[PDB]
Design a binder for this molecule. Sequence first.
Ligand SMILES: N[C@@H](CC(=O)O)C(=O)O
Ligand SMILES: N[C@@H](CC(=O)O)C(=O)O
Lengths: 543, 543
Amino acid sequence: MNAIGNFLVGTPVFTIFICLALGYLLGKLKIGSFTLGATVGVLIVALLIGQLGVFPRDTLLGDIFFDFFMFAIGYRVGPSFISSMKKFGAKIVYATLIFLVSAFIVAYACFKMFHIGPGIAAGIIAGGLTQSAVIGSSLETISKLPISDHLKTLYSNQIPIVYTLTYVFGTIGVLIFLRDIMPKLMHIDLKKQAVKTAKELDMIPVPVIVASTHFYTINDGSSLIGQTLGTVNTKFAKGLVAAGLNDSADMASVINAGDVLAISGGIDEIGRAVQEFNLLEVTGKTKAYVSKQVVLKKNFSADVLKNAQDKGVLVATLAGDVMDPAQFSTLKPAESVTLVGQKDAVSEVQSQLGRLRAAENIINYSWFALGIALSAALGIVGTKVSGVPIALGGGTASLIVGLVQSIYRDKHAHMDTIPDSLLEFFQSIGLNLFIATVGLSAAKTFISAIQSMGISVLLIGAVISILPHIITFVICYYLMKMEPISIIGAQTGADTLSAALNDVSERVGSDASPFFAAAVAPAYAIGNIFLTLMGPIFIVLLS
Amino acid sequence: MNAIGNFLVGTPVFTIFICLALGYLLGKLKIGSFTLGATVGVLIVALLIGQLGVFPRDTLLGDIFFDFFMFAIGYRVGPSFISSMKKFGAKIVYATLIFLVSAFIVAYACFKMFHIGPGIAAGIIAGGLTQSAVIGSSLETISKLPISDHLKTLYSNQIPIVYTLTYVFGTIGVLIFLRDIMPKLMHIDLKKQAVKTAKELDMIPVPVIVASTHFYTINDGSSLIGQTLGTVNTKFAKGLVAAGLNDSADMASVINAGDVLAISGGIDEIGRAVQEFNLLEVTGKTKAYVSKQVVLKKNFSADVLKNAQDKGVLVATLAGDVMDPAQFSTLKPAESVTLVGQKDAVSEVQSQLGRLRAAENIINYSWFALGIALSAALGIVGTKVSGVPIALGGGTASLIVGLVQSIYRDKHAHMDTIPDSLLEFFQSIGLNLFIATVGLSAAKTFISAIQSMGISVLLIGAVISILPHIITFVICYYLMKMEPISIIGAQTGADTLSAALNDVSERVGSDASPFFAAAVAPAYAIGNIFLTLMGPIFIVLLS
Ligand SMILES: N[C@@H](CC(=O)O)C(=O)O
Ligand SMILES: N[C@@H](CC(=O)O)C(=O)O
């Protein structure tokens, strides 16, 4: 009975990664009509495990794995923010401002009416308004602010316990309220209304067809044998070209017998070409005919574009698509494009068109590390407001750093892009690891604190977690008469619920997912910054 | 001058992630004809940075980020190990055994001839034989073994300093020796000889063609209008089927006008079909006609396979390819396969064929965490040999756990697969972070130790890093007369050099990369286990 606790305290890695394994299973368990979720399951399992031992809490591991989560969230939100700012109106920002004001007023009123101490107030804020940087910011503010030392220790110790108590209700309750109750009240379907609104706007994604090189070989005795390749290419419709016979690129090489054309262009265009003149579609074996993407120079000469069209290299954008010849003159200078053709001829046109680009798969670890370092440096800075040393915080600055990096990489393509699955791994495991560490830390005195303050730490959290959403929903839908889905988006962005974001995104469908992302993106940054700042101000005010 | 040090010691995240950013740039700097590399650049930058402050070392962060690296390496090596054991001979294992014996003899002789103390001996082993778990295993062994307390502190403190000194020469020197000097001595080219040997064997990868659904629409008045769909499907050659008109699947629906066939099969087969009867290749817009992968049941009925061939569902393996009908009877029971067809008809055949499978992109975080926990638990176990409490170690057990998990997931496909870029991120950043932490730790007393022991800690490391490779190369090539490339593979696997592995793999070409991986894979596990065990034995013997 003691040996198991000795083993658990001896090996922290086993404890941390065994409080993270069973949590996902508990979250994926289906009980009744609600699923607990990964974070809540991890918190419950950590709370149960932590009773056995006296495990302490490591600050650096949690800080790093939370900075990774914040950077991943900022990177994912990045591209949608500027698009929502351009196209969606300011009502998205206005809803967040209303929600923040309402939460401030309700929290102040409840804390004043119940005389809640500053430590419990910080815990209730950090739990009901689901933000994790509040714990660290409040600890730093409590350390800086002048009080008795015993008061400092008590206030610093009481925060994680109240955090773990109220976090349990916040995620599940607000998820249920924003996923079922509000759609039932508005008498809409989440899929249908969002699809209709996305159809009204132009957020609906449009698929892009990419040209490819298909190796059609010649039918012998087709009566077209004996025509020069340049005239055959001019015979092809707009957007077509033949790379050349075998792996060679020669202007005047008439058809001999059964040789390959390697037609490049759009699928329907190749189809009409085949119906114009029959050809054998053969898989072929050649590694020379490969496309390449290259960033252009500032001069971005178009005469070389015409000469490459004559030469046998199809022009396409970075995504890959045939484009109008009139776009040659009015192209964007120094814009990366993709071309298909011969092994070295594409490189020749590249040398005459611009510097070589870089592949998507490779990752700039130097840029990753520099982003993390700049996030920490930005979080260092802080100002004082009437004796309150407020600071941006470590996690909050990472969101801004990721946003700026994504926006700047969208324009300037010199830097490479982080793979998609890496971001999902980052956010998921980082958030669950931070939650597991906190829950393992605050576990021994859990039962003592739930004996000391039973109902005056859960009902307050429930009220502060539910009431502002109801007020802002009523104001937005009944009085101001906004659109249906943007209300959900703005509320779930202001409350900073990534689980609710993901659940509504997966329920709504892939068609309107770039709509919901645009609805949520402007809210997240303002909500995070103001909720991070709310903590120290509340501690100072109730103190 | 003091403020910068105060900032650096105040914020460990900034220091750790700023000693990791400049390191990659320094490694990618081109000086002369050699590149320093990421790990060596990080060590140099960490050593320069650590002079300013008094930063301590965190054990948990390094342990976790090294366990991730070891798990990623084991997962990548996994599939090749059993294939190399089956096809490559036992000479691969024999070369590693010879190398380990030679390294043991040379190290014992040098340490006895120079009376090197046990701590310096552990450091020299951990540096010259590039293995990082030696530090932790030696620290644990020194803690357990009975000596005077001052001796314990001195021996524990001297290890990282000697480690950082000799690690610099090991990677660069052995990389140069195994990449240029040995090919010059054997008078071979790394690309050509490996390609020839892979052609002699059957390690050469073979590309696989996957069938797809192409929506050919009907030419009006083609004289084939008015034939039932079943007879048209039987008219199609072996390996072809038409899903059905529009998005429907009806057996008797004659061609009306300009309707789509949605031909499915191999590209060349569709080409001969189009030449048999002309069709318009149109991109089309339909989301119903999507393929699915499903794991089969044990009964794996083949009558339903024939009925699905009649029905209009093409049969393919998980990779995706047309397969012979005679393979229907002799298929593997409960083997996952992929089918193309209608939105729900594929699900019908699935219901009659087996349980639904899972997608590639999704990751089982529960399996990841359980693997890490089992790695720690396996590393806990240990035995005693004449008073030496040897143990497997934390990092070493992770390699075995990853190997077993990859091998078991290859057979049983219920568990999902980790994405590829995640493994590369894991190994790279984890190894560089551990190296940065160690270098930042052992920096203040670096100059004092290089004043105390100048030349008697570098020449010994160079000799122990160079000489065993020369001996084993001479024995393998001149006396035993082995094959050329397997010598390089076995030596680079026995020395456990991931940088050398990656560099030779990228230089050799993608064609022979699954050959070099098979040549290196058997060596790595035995080398890691024996090099991890070598440390405590050496400490006890020289003590
Ligand atoms: N999405 C939330 C998760 C949490 O609070 O733990 C946040 O980043 O604030
Ligand atoms: N590939 C080496 C790297 C190192 O020693 O740091 C190893 O895992 O042992």
